[PDB]
Structures are given as structure tokens and as C-alpha cells.
Design a protein around this ligand. Structure first.
Ligand SMILES: O=P(O)(O)OC[C@H]1O[C@@H](O)[C@H](O)[C@@H](O)[C@@H]1O
Ligand code: ALF
Ligand SMILES: [Mg+2]
Length: 219
């Protein structure tokens, strides 16, 4: 039986992938780049703040100064941080709170494997901090998603091997990170976005302990 679950945050625990998208799209447009639509945004999910900005600049073969790059990343973060101030426990996605309770009651470790530097603040807004045994610090890993490092760090932080863990993700980059960590991925979203080669559920209500057990036994 698996011994840990490694959670992505944005688009898994709550609908903040939507807010990252809106904030990045707004930034892109301010700089005259119009290609950040929902389809392109699938390439941005899971990616660090700096890598996100770079992917956007690349879309338009645009170069900015180092000073401008720093200011643009700050402007997007400042906007995003404003957007999330009113997040509350009411915004926890369906199933997630119950899953945390059920994991905790079955002595399964719970770790956050988020790229977001806003992760701790969001878990506090949602009254979830006390369910997490560890939060992997995304500033500490030498490499970000789709590198596996953040998932490996999350597993190690709760004393479990990645191979004894499930990872939950909504992104292409994050699914790849889980695969390369040795943990078992279960995605949430559309197979058209996340692939047909892993288990994908259509919405978070499917993330029950019963189902995670259902998947572990088979794969
Ligand atoms: O800018 P932050 O809060 O550090 O977030 C980093 C990344 O965190 C990931 O969880 C999101 O999927 C990305 O969209 C985001 O860019
Ligand atoms: F959506 Al995340 F780390 F929270 F990629
Ligand atoms: Mg996500």
C-alpha cells in the first residue's frame, strides 16, 4: 500500500490555476503578446514563475532586459497575490478535504509538492495547513517541473520513497515530474491535455481514498 500522497496545489486543491492563467494572460497582453489562450496555458501549468514568463516571451520571440524581466515577474505576482486574498475554505475543491481527513486517519503521509511560492499562504487561507505533514520548499530544489525534484523532495520530507507515493496533478509538466520521480501519477483534467497513458479523473470528487487504493492495486 502507498505510504504518502504528494499534492500539487493549483488546479488540484483549489481553482487557482484559473487565476494564474488570468494573471499571466493580463501580463502578456500588457507587453503586446496575445498568444496566451487556454490552449497555450496548458504549457504554463506547473511551471515556475520565471519559467512561465520566459515561455511567454519565447512565444513572441521577445527579449527584455534583466531589469524588465524582474519587474514583469513582480507585477504578475503582485496581481495574483491580490486576486487570491479572498480565497477561503469554501474554495477547497470537492473531495479534497475529505481525502485529507481519510489519509490522515489511515496514517498515510500528506505532502505539498507545489512550485508556488504562494502555496503556504493558500493552505492557510483554506484552513488546510494542519493536514500537511510537509511542504516542499520550491525555492530549495535545484530544478522545477517537469523535473521530478519537487516530488522527490516532498516524499523525502515525510520519510517515504517516491516509489511508495501517489502524486496528484492537473498539468502536463507535473505529470511528467511525477513519472520521473518514481511516484504513481493520477491526473485531474482532460486526457486531451494530460495524456492517455496514466489514470486521469474528470474532477477532484474522484480523488477518494477508495479510488486511490483502486489504482494502486492495479498499477
Ligand atoms: O508564482 P508562484 O506562486 O510561485 O507559482 C508558480 C507556479 O505554481 C504552479 O503550481 C502553477 O501551476 C503555475 O501556474 C505557477 O506559475
Ligand atoms: F499547480 Al502546482 F505546483 F501547485 F504546479
Ligand atoms: Mg497545478
Amino acid at each position: 500500500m502507498f505510504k504518502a500522497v504528494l499534492f500539487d496545489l493549483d488546479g488540484v486543491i483549489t481553482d487557482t490555476a484559473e487565476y494564474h492563467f488570468r494573471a499571466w494572460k493580463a501580463l502578456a497582453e500588457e507587453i503586446g503578446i496575445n498568444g496566451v489562450d487556454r490552449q497555450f496555458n496548458e504549457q504554463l501549468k506547473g511551471v515556475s514563475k520565471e519559467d512561465s514568463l520566459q515561455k511567454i516571451l519565447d512565444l513572441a520571440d521577445k527579449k527584455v532586459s534583466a531589469e524588465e524581466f524582474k519587474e514583469l515577474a513582480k507585477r504578475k505576482n503582485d496581481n495574483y497575490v491580490k486576486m487570491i486574498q479572498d480565497v477561503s475554505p469554501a474554495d477547497v475543491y470537492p473531495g479534497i478535504l475529505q481525502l485529507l481527513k481519510d489519509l490522515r486517519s489511515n496514517k498515510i503521509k500528506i505532502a505539498l509538492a507545489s512550485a508556488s511560492k504562494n502555496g503556504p499562504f493558500l493552505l492557510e487561507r483554506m484552513n488546510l495547513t494542519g493536514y500537511f505533514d510537509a511542504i516542499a520548499d520550491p525555492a530549495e530544489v535545484a530544478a522545477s517541473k517537469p523535473a521530478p525534484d519537487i516530488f522527490i523532495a516532498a516524499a523525502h520530507a515525510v520519510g517515504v520513497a517516491p516509489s511508495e507515493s501517489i502524486g496528484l496533478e492537473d498539468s502536463q509538466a507535473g505529470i511528467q515530474a511525477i513519472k520521473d520521480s518514481g511516484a504513481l501519477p493520477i491526473g485531474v483534467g482532460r486526457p486531451e491535455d494530460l495524456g492517455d497513458d496514466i489514470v486521469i479523473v474528470p474532477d477532484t470528487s474522484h480523488y477518494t481514498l477508495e479510488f486511490l487504493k483502486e489504482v494502486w492495486l492495479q498499477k
